[PDB]
Ligand binder design. Structure first.
Ligand SMILES: C[S@@+](CC[C@H](N)C(=O)[O-])C[C@H]1O[C@@H](n2cnc3c(N)ncnc32)[C@H](O)[C@@H]1O
Length: 229
């Protein structure tokens, strides 16, 4: 009997509980359940991924087509907070991948630094994502930008980081809480405005979705970055 199967997305597993392979067996990050499966000499541990805490988990359970975060990927994560979702991104990309965890709160930054002591593939970048010139010497070109900064100017922030760091043909995944971007606009008006702005920066959405029943008026937009020469 197989208990934990690979998900459609490489590096994600499904146990309906979503889980990732724990890069640091024995350690939990935010109190999540861990499931360790031993058979003979083999052993693998997974970590439960809470879709009421992690917008990316809610999107995956909501049926997103691609997430682009995969084993070996280099990810620029904007708005890393204390590392809840970053820890699962770190699990997915694995030892040969890389996650830059950009977060400007020093309080949250201390949690990220402690998390990255055990995870070799996390670089805490405790800086303001509006000013990538201050950290551009730390960020090698990346494959994916994941953004969840919950700011009215999030699209401009993401575009500036994309134009600096994202490879041609790389991808983006942007989390959008409508009332964090413009609380006097309707969710549809916010999401349409943000999609429009992305397209103008050669961030072409390939999929957009909302996150019910985990979150209300909260979208995830996934797409590809195809800038001019
Ligand atoms: C919704 S929380 C992120 C939750 C996190 N993505 C997760 O799922 O684990 C938004 C975060 O973005 C951070 N943030 C907001 N504006 C920022 C900026 N200009 N630069 C860096 N971090 C920023 C906030 O401090 C906060 O930690």
């Amino acid at each position: 009997n197989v208990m934990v199967e690979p998900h459609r997305h490489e590096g994600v597993f499904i146990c309906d509980a979503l889980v990732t392979k724990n890069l640091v067996p024995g350690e939990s990050v935010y109190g999540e359940k861990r499931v360790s499966i031993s058979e003979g000499d083999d052993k693998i541990e997974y970590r439960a991924w809470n879709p009421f805490r992690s917008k990316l988990a809610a999107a995956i359970l909501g049926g997103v087509d691609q997430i682009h975060i995969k084993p070996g990927a280099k990810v620029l994560y904007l708005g890393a907070a204390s590392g809840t979702t970053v820890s699962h991104v770190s699990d997915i990309v694995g030892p040969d991948g890389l996650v830059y965890a950009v977060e400007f709160s020093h309080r949250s930054g201390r949690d990220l630094i402690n998390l990255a002591k055990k995870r070799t593939n996390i670089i805490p970048v405790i800086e303001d994502a509006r000013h990538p010139h201050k950290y551009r010497m730390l960020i090698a070109m990346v494959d994916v930008i994941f953004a969840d900064v919950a700011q009215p100017d999030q699209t401009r922030i993401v575009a500036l980081n994309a134009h600096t760091f994202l490879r041609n043909g790389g991808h983006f995944v942007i989390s959008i809480k409508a009332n964090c971007i413009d609380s006097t606009a309707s969710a549809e008006a916010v999401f349409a405005s943000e999609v429009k702005k992305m397209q103008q920066e050669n961030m072409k959405p390939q999929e957009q979705l909302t996150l019910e029943p985990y979150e209300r008026d909260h979208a995830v937009v996934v797409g590809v970055y195809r800038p001019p020469p």
